[PDB]
Structure formats: structure tokens, C-alpha cells
Swiss-Prot record:
Binds 1 [4Fe-4S] cluster. The cluster does not appear to play a role in catalysis, but is probably involved in the proper positioning of the enzyme along the DNA strand. The active site is at residue 37. It catalyses: Hydrolyzes free adenine bases from 7,8-dihydro-8-oxoguanine:adenine mismatched double-stranded DNA, leaving an apurinic site. This is Adenine DNA glycosylase. It comes from the Bacteria. Belongs to the Nth/MutY family. The record marks 138 as: Transition state stabilizer. The gene is mutY. It comes from Escherichia coli (strain K12). The keyword Hydrolase applies. Adenine glycosylase active on G-A mispairs. MutY also corrects error-prone DNA synthesis past GO lesions which are due to the oxidatively damaged form of guanine: 7,8-dihydro-8-oxoguanine (8-oxo-dGTP). [4Fe-4S] cluster binds at residues 192, 199, 202, 208. Disulfide bonds: none annotated. It is an enzyme of class 3 (hydrolase). Its cofactor is [4Fe-4S] cluster.
């Protein structure tokens, strides 16, 4: 599928069916997007919403979070699991307060330098909260791309990972980047699922190679 057709079909789908009312999509800021991305990394959206609201009420700004005792952060995290996320969350808040005056930095290198924030999370923060032109690649997004373009191989191999990042850059547009990047997460979370994807509801079904061959189980590849 031509990349300009890929992006247009995904944005047209998002306009009518996409999620736009999650709390971290209303009056968006780099802090709110960062906080939601870290909570969502290993936890389902329904579990996250009450925690996100409790964290924003107690810590309205990243400086408030930075100045709080770590034990209070860990207490409020209880039930989200994967507490390395919370330790790094607090360290990153302290880095923003100390190096950046309490305001989130707006360059890719400074955001990726934060503890707990990798290449995809940095692009997510900058594209979704400020409209900067970066693509994303988490497991949801990688599964949509690998099925549509038939990318076999284990993404734990560098050459496969690099092919998937290049494909993501290619289909991600500049105009509407915030809509496209949320739409791709929506698609991998609710439609292009690990088992038995819902191809009839997918706006890529007219050009997807896995759908044409009923071969979604091959993409992405598994660990050997
Ligand atoms: S058509 Fe099916 S396999 Fe292809 S991207 Fe959409 S849901 Fe995934």
C-alpha cells in the first residue's frame, strides 16, 4: 500500500471512530502525555484512568511530583505493577525540575534522556502534545505495520527493528501527526489484536498483505 494512501485511510477512520475523550487527550500538555504513556506501558486503559486522575489531582505540575517524597509516589502507584516505572517516573520529574526549569523540554534528545523514556515514548510525547513530526513503535503499532506490509522476523533482532522504524516513519504524516499516532494505537489495541484480528472493521483491509492471505499469525515473527 502506498504510504500516502495508508495515512489518509487511517486519518479518515480516526475522524469517525477514534478515541478522543480520554483524560490525557483534553487540554493536552507534555506532562499529561508523559504520565499517561508511562502508566499505559504495561497496564490496560480502564485500570489506568482512575490512577491518572488521582496523580493529576495530587501533582498538578511536574515540579509538584519532583518535590514529593518517593514513598508517596510509590503508595499512589500501588496496584499498577511494574514499579521500576514509578521509580523512573520520579527521577524523570526531578530531571525536568533541575535541568529544564520545571518545563518539559521540546527536543527529541532531551526527552529521550529522561529515565524510563525510550525512542517511542519520546516521539509519543512530542508528537501528541506539541505536534512535532515523530513516529511511534510499541507492540500495538508494530503489529499493524508488520501485518499490513508482511514484515516477518523477530523484532528483537536489530535489522527487523530497524525495518519497522523505517516503515513507521514512512507512513506517519506531518499534517495530523497527533491524530494518526493515536489512531495507530487504537487500531492495534481494539482491531488488529494478537489473536483473530477484526479485519472487517479495519481501514487497512483493502491493502493489507496479511488479510489478503489470511496469514496474520506470521507477523510479527516470534522469538526463535
Ligand atoms: S486488515 Fe486485519 S491484519 Fe491487516 S492491519 Fe487490519 S486488522 Fe491487522
Amino acid at each position: 500500500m502506498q504510504a500516502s494512501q495508508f495515512s489518509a485511510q487511517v486519518l479518515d477512520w480516526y475522524d469517525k471512530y477514534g478515541r478522543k475523550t480520554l483524560p490525557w487527550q483534553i487540554d493536552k500538555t507534555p506532562y499529561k502525555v508523559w504520565l499517561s504513556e508511562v502508566m499505559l506501558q504495561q497496564t490496560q486503559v480502564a485500570t489506568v484512568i482512575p490512577y491518572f486522575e488521582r496523580f493529576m489531582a495530587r501533582f498538578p505540575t511536574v515540579t509538584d511530583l519532583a518535590n514529593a517524597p518517593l514513598d508517596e509516589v510509590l503508595h499512589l502507584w500501588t496496584g499498577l505493577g511494574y514499579y521500576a516505572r514509578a521509580r523512573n517516573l520520579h527521577k524523570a520529574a526531578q530531571q525536568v525540575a533541575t535541568l529544564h526549569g520545571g518545563k518539559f523540554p521540546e527536543t527529541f534528545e532531551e526527552v529521550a534522556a529522561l529515565p524510563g523514556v525510550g525512542r517511542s515514548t519520546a516521539g509519543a510525547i512530542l508528537s501528541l502534545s506539541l505536534g512535532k513530526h515523530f513516529p511511534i513503535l510499541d507492540g500495538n503499532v508494530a503489529r499493524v505495520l508488520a501485518r499490513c506490509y508482511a514484515v516477518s522476523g523477530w523484532p528483537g533482532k536489530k535489522e527487523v527493528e530497524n525495518k519497522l522504524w523505517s516503515l513507521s516513519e514512512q507512513v506517519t504524516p506531518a499534517v495530523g501527526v497527533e491524530r494518526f499516532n493515536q489512531a495507530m494505537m487504537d487500531l492495534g489495541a481494539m482491531i488488529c489484536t494478537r489473536s483473530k484480528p477484526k479485519c472487517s472493521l479495519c481501514p487497512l483491509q483493502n491493502g493489507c498483505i496479511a488479510a489478503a492471505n489470511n496469514s496474520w499469525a506470521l507477523y510479527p515473527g516470534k522469538k526463535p
